[PDB]
Design a protein around this nucleic acid. Structure first.
Lengths: 70, 106, 66, 117
RNA sequence: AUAAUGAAAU
RNA sequence: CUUGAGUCUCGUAGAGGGGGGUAGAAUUCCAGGUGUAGCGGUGAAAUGCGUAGAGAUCUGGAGGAAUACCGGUGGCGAAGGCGGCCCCCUGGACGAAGACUGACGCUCAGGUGCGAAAGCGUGGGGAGCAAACAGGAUUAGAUACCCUGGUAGUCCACGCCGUAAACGAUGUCGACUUGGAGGUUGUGCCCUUGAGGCGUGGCUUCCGGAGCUAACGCGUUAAGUCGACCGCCUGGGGAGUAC
């Protein structure tokens, strides 16, 4: 995330550009997840749980639009 | 015999020996019933990150067909020479004779 | 999803082609996921191989701060 | 002293403290201030207000060198990334650049074990 | 933040 | 005799196995420059480090462990398991069109091999973190959970041990029996509208019909309908213990 202040450019715009670039790069997430060690079992379990939850939510929301609430 | 692609890089302040190097290696390959399919000399280029406090390396590319003992000896020469700072040897499926993207838009 | 390599019928991705390889890395030097660019799996794998070869030969960077 | 007119501000922002150090363009230090040494202790040491106060004090402690232009480098995840930059702009310098240099390993060493409390 | 225990029957 | 089982010819995808080189990010330590009172840690603290100049910032060097992004209900392996890049040696699977042998097959008591982590023997290596151990704290006590330190081990070569919720808690082989939506890897044809349709193989995820089941549920990758061979059970404790 490298930001160069352009001519005539105010300071708030540059600051917001900095924040947006860092959000796109995603450094805070990496730093937070590398703080403690995680076992391979826990890693695999988290991945599977996320996939199952996402699939089920998609199915439920796609099948919930065939009923009338009132 | 198999088909190989070779790339090597040279110190910027020793660019006056590259033609002699090319001649010597080509002679070594051709003396053992080998062939040379493509040869290219790219000149000096800016590096993407420094190597040993340097930028601006000199690049050479070759595409050949030869036995394995010759390639082994060539690698040994690269290892023990001090003008060469990096090198790569790869295997190919067929001979390559077309032109590279570096001799079409440089 | 649209794939340029499949559309043009390519055999290899040519680690020497910096112009093509530039379209698949971010401003930090990271490889871009396939679900954003719409490539196929075969060609995504070939592409990662090519980018790593270029990184070693020093035609591409590893990170934006060296 | 010797005038400089061009400097770099380094911000070190952890989950427990903030450190600000102003330097010339070759890495030679001129002054520093920290959040824990500005009247704050414990829970109040890790808040954006403390980081702001530290930025003000660091700006003051280098007024004899006559600095005009400043680059900014930020390193760390803690609270204090933005308050410091705002305070430096307010103090009256001109910001020319902003860079992030937080270090990330390409799979090196084993971290400590998870806390169970 | 931590933070214990309750005879057997009807 | 050729339909089960095999051999030959052309290709394709893959973290399948063994050996040797090499690259970039980051941690720790060692020697220098600038600079001056705090750093580190917790729910709150203090043991610890610091004017004998720490922490912060810049430059040079040493060492050994792991490979961000790609990366996914993705791939390969009999299971255990396998992930940076390049070279050498090597095992299996699958598809198209032909040729060849002629039941050469399935299962398997005793037998023999392979087999995560921890542990054991001899010789090396040791950033990071970590049983045992020492000191802050918390508490009625705290041989704990939290904090500051820390060695066996974790790494390499050769040899032992033979066990795990070693799990799909579901032995191996063959045949038959309505459907829908996806993933990955081969191959044939074309109305011709050169960018799209129509077919045919191997592996794999989710839902669900008849039937089955004590129920939960399984459902062409069966726990449905059948055939061939093997292993195992017979109330709870004592006990997978004693001799």
């Amino acid at each position: 995330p490298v930001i160069k202040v352009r001519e005539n450019e105010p300071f708030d715009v540059a600051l917001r550009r900095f924040k947006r670039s860092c959000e796109k790069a995603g450094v805070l997430a990496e730093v937070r997840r590398r703080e403690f060690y995680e076992k391979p079992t826990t890693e695999r379990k988290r991945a599977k749980a996320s996939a199952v939850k996402r699939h089920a939510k998609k199915l439920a929301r796609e099948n919930a639009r065939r009923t009338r609430l009132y | 015999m198999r088909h190989y692609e070779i790339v090597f890089m040279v110190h910027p302040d020793q660019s006056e020996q590259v033609p002699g190097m090319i001649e010597r290696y080509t002679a070594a390959i051709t003396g053992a019933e080998g062939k040379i399919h493509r040869l290219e000399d790219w000149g000096r280029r800016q590096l993407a990150y420094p190597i040993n406090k340097l930028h601006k390396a000199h690049y050479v590319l070759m595409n050949v067909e030869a036995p394995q003992e010759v390639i082994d000896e060539l690698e040994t020469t690269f290892r023990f020479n001090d003008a060469v700072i990096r090198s790569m040897v790869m295997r190919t499926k067929h001979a390559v004779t077309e032109a590279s993207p570096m001799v079409k838009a440089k | 999803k649209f794939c340029r390599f499949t559309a043009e019928g390519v055999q290899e991705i040519d680690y020497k082609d910096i112009a093509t390889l530039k379209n698949y890395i971010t401003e930090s030097g990271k490889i871009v996921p396939s679900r954003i660019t719409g490539t196929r799996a075969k060609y995504q794998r070939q592409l990662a191989r090519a980018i790593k070869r270029a990184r070693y030969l020093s035609l591409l960077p590893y990170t934006d701060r060296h | 002293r010797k005038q400089v007119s061009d400097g770099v501000a380094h911000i070190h922002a952890s989950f427990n403290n903030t450190i600000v150090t102003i330097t010339d363009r070759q890495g030679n230090a001129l002054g520093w201030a920290t959040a824990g040494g500005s009247g704050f202790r414990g829970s109040r040491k890790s808040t954006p207000f403390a980081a702001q106060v530290a930025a003000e004090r660091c700006a003051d402690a280098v007024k004899e060198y006559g600095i005009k232009n400043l680059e900014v480098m930020v390193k760390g995840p803690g609270p204090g990334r933005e308050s410091t930059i705002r305070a430096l702009n307010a103090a009256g310098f001109r910001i020319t650049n902003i860079t992030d240099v937080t270090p990330i390993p390409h799979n090196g060493c084993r971290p400590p074990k998870k806390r169970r409390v």
